[PDB]
Amino acid sequence: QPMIYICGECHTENEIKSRDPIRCRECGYRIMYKKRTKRLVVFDAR
Template sequence: MSETPNSMMSTPSGRTPGRTPRPGEVPVPGQPKAMVYICGECHQENEIRARDPIRCRECGCRIMYKKRTKRMVVFDAR
């Protein structure tokens, strides 16, 4: 009987032991997560995945800005 390494074993629920998902993380196998960027010229929203060319789909501009997060960001001022 061949043995499988500990990293390849999984629990009955299908999760790999030793790896806890981060809050809000949804694992999607085989599909890179798309980020939303805003074009610097025409201000259209574009979804860009990893390894995609950084270019607006509307006007072709290469200046893209990352869309602001919806989470509240708090800084301590001293």
């Protein structure tokens, strides 16, 4: 539900809800990245 994103410039973990302009609350940077999922991906070391 929270969908916490990371700032491209300040690297801050901040929560943003839908219908919200994409703005970091710590520095106002406009580019955000999603965090790595918690799902379990498996690799054959090959």
